Every structure is written in C-alpha cells, then in structure tokens.
Amino acid sequence: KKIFKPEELRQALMPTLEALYRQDPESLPFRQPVDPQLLGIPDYFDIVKNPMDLSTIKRKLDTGQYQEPWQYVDDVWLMFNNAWLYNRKTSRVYKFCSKLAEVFEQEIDPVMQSLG
Ligand SMILES: CC(=O)c1ccc(OCCN2CC3(COC3)C2)c(NC(=O)c2cc(NC(=O)c3ccco3)cc(-c3ccn(C)n3)c2)c1
Numbered sequence: 001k002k003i004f005k006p007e008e009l010r011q012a013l014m015p016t017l018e019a020l021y022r023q024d025p026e027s028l029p030f031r032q033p034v035d036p037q038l039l040g041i042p043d044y045f046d047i048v049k050n051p052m053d054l055s056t057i058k059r060k061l062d063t064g065q066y067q068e069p070w071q072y073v074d075d076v077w078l079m080f081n082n083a084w085l086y087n088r089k090t091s092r093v094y095k096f097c098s099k100l101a102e103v104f105e106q107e108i109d110p111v112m113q114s115l116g
Helices: 006-021 054-062 069-086 092-114
Strands: none
Touching: 006 054, 006 069, 006 092, 054 069, 069 092
C-alpha cells in the first residue's frame, strides 16, 4: 500500500534516465522518437506498435505519469525491446541498445532497493 509522490519518483529515477542520455554515441538513436520517414525506415510502424524513447519517458517523469517505479522501468524496457525487435542483431542500433541496457541495469538496481 506504499504511495510514491511525483517528486519522490522524479528525484530517485531521473538520474537513471540521465545516465542513459550521457551515453554518447549509444543514446543518440534514442533521444527523440523514431521518425520512420526522416530515418528512411518507412516500415517501422508496421513492426513497432508502441514506440518509446528517452524524451517521452522524460516527459512522463516530469508530468507525474508514473505512480510506481516499475511503470518507469517498464517504459525503459519497452524502448529496449522495440530496438531489439526492429533492428538486426548486427546493426548499430541493436548494439547501442544492448549497451544502454547494461548501463541501465547497473544504475537502476541500487535505486529499486532503496525505493521499495
Ligand atoms: C530506435 C530505432 O529502432 C532506430 C532504428 C534506426 C535508426 O536509424 C536508421 C539509420 N540511420 C541512422 C543513421 C546513422 O547516421 C544516421 C543511419 C535509428 N536512429 C539512429 O540510428 C540515429 C543515429 C544517430 N547517430 C549515431 O548513432 C552516431 C554514432 C556516431 C556518431 O553518430 C543519430 C540519430 C538522430 C536522429 C535525430 N537526431 C538529432 N539524431 C539517429 C533508430
């Protein structure tokens, strides 16, 4: 029955998002929503039905749309799963995604233990 205030969640969780943003070049494919037309991948929305990216997740943190830490974590892993799904295993974005996933697991595990 534990209650999380929006600012309590933002303060605990926003550093883990900032850690993803700090990965350069690995975060560059993920800082804005995929634009299938600009990127030259017009089939993207045929395959990815629930797009997610760092900027969307940041706006949900900034607007209190997460009531529970796991809802935040779900959006981060939705972003990873999208990239692993759409992109080939040998591709730039897949490998960049795998790097972000490792960085995220490191940053989030101590925060989940302290939150709860
Ligand atoms: C999320 C997902 O499933 C997905 C699929 C395919 C994608 O792309 C298709 C390929 N095209 C990207 C290129 C390579 O160059 C453009 C070929 C992307 N998107 C990127 O891969 C990307 C990469 C950089 N850049 C560096 O990865 C990099 C490494 C070293 C130097 O720069 C930037 C950006 C970007 C978009 C807007 N902005 C301001 N920036 C996007 C994302």
